[PDB]
Amino acid sequence: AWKGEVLANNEAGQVTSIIYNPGDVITIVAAGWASYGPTQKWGPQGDREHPDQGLICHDAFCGALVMKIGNSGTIPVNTGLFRWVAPNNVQGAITLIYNDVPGTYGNNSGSFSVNIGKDQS
Amino acid sequence: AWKGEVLANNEAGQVTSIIYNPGDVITIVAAGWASYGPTQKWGPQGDREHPDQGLICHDAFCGALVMKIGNSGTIPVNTGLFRWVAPNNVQGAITLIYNDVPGTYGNNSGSFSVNIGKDQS
Amino acid sequence: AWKGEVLANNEAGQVTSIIYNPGDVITIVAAGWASYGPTQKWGPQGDREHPDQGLICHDAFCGALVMKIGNSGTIPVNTGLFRWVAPNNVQGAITLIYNDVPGTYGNNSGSFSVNIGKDQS
Amino acid sequence: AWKGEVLANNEAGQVTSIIYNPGDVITIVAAGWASYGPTQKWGPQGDREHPDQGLICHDAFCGALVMKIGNSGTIPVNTGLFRWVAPNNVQGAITLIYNDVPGTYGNNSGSFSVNIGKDQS
Ligand SMILES: OC[C@H]1O[C@@H](O)[C@H](O)[C@@H](O)[C@H]1O
Ligand SMILES: OC[C@H]1O[C@H](O)[C@H](O)[C@@H](O)[C@H]1O
Ligand SMILES: OC[C@H]1O[C@H](O)[C@H](O)[C@@H](O)[C@H]1O
Ligand SMILES: OC[C@H]1O[C@H](O)[C@H](O)[C@@H](O)[C@H]1O
Ligand SMILES: [Ca+2]
Ligand SMILES: [Ca+2]
Ligand SMILES: [Ca+2]
Ligand SMILES: [Ca+2]
């Protein structure tokens, strides 16, 4: 299991120690407050009022938490995933990423605290 | 495990099938958009800008998800809890509740989708 | 979780810190070598060749590991239990006992090492 | 989880469905009665009084339950493993095997019943 923080200004993403293997069941819980630029902050579901201006994940709001598994496409995480299984061909290290437009992470602030574990089978 | 939806207008909150006993380790993941009155909506951490005007839980923002376990006081859930152990002597059925001021739930809207499971211990 | 030793000459049994609650799923693994009297020793399944001369558990061999949950009757453990659930109305502290005839524990020797955990639900 | 029986007379051993990946935590519980030749039978810890005359696993008794994980050497299982983690660089499918001297399985009898599960990690 992994516990850390995903900084909103970290464009490359936070690599975790979790390697998602075929058949794994995982749970993720995310919490905290961050911004993609404004004074206002949002939690891991991001800002439902802000338009998509070229986000790394089009299936979540700006300011949301998303992930890749290996070099997969971005997968929405938001507040977390409960006993979740990836698509069959998806595997590799889990990288956690704040959802913003490429090149615009430098003005971000805050972070999410994220915990990941593998469930029993 | 238990999966269900907690309505923001339900002042009594929603009882779940989960009985918490001493020693138990639990994980909760909560998702969704709800409001305590305004046309805006907030996730399970609620509205960090809004003052406490007599909330059922003073340790969480207005519009946050909270819970009671048996005869306990309110405990913040927010986005969830990862492999969490309850305070000393806490025991009984988990009830989930939207954090608002008593008597003011009538103008609330939306819901949270919540999963609760017991972990290994 | 709990780990410890169960002495073959302990007629009262070894109380554990595990309280079995309704709906709990438990796993037990036991190891070691013990005797009810003879110079030979046996594992946690006991001695399949020896007759029952008034054992505390008639559903296990002499020299087997058994348990009580609360003030239940004796339940065979043997080498252990995998993701096991108790019958209705069985609850309380787990006590681990060597299966021998009452009043005859004085000539017993050896012990079993036992691990107990609660599983995910 | 996987469940099955490991025949004492099966020199190839029993290939399970469990794939051990780095970081995985496993639990095994084994039960039953088997022999390496004599008319008497022993549990999964084997015969503590028999010498090692060239066993496939020199770290367990003759008649004990052992395993290999992918390409690895033999590892003792005995009555089971509780929340066990393998070394660095040990991975793959788990094969269960009765511990006897190669070429001498033909006179063996009985079997062990084995449950294997992956724990939370
Ligand atoms: O059947 C149980 C009895 O077995 C005898 O062999 C032993 O010496 C007694 O102490 C008692 O344990
Ligand atoms: O739409 C995303 C965009 O939003 C605002 O304009 C921010 O100031 C930028 O940094 C970028 O995050
Ligand atoms: O502070 C809580 C309070 O917030 C606003 O006033 C809402 O309109 C009320 O219904 C109540 O929820
Ligand atoms: O030591 C192992 C050896 O034990 C006895 O000799 C059995 O008869 C053999 O088949 C072999 O299993
Ligand atoms: Ca930005
Ligand atoms: Ca309200
Ligand atoms: Ca005795
Ligand atoms: Ca043999």
UniProtKB/Swiss-Prot annotation, chains A, B, C, D:
Source organism: Pseudomonas aeruginosa (strain ATCC 15692 / DSM 22644 / CIP 104116 / JCM 14847 / LMG 12228 / 1C / PRS 101 / PAO1)
Function according to Swiss-Prot or TrEMBL: D-galactose specific lectin. Binds in decreasing order of affinity: melibiose, methyl-alpha-D-galactoside, D-galactose, methyl-beta-D-galactoside, N-acetyl-D-galactosamine. Similar to plant lectins in its selective (carbohydrate-specific) hemagglutinating activity.
Family (UniProt): Belongs to the LecA/PllA lectin family.
GO cellular-component term (any): cell surface
Localization of this protein: Cytoplasm; Periplasm; Cell surface
Gene: lecA
Highest taxon listed in the record's lineage: Bacteria
Gene3D superfamilies, A to Z: Galactose-binding lectin
Pfam families for this protein: PA-IL
GO molecular function, one term: carbohydrate binding
Name this polypeptide is given: PA-I galactophilic lectin
InterPro entries, per database record: Galactose-bd-like_sf, PA-IL
GO biological process: heterophilic cell-cell adhesion via plasma membrane cell adhesion molecules
Record-linked SUPFAM superfamilies: Galactose-binding domain-like (SSF49785)
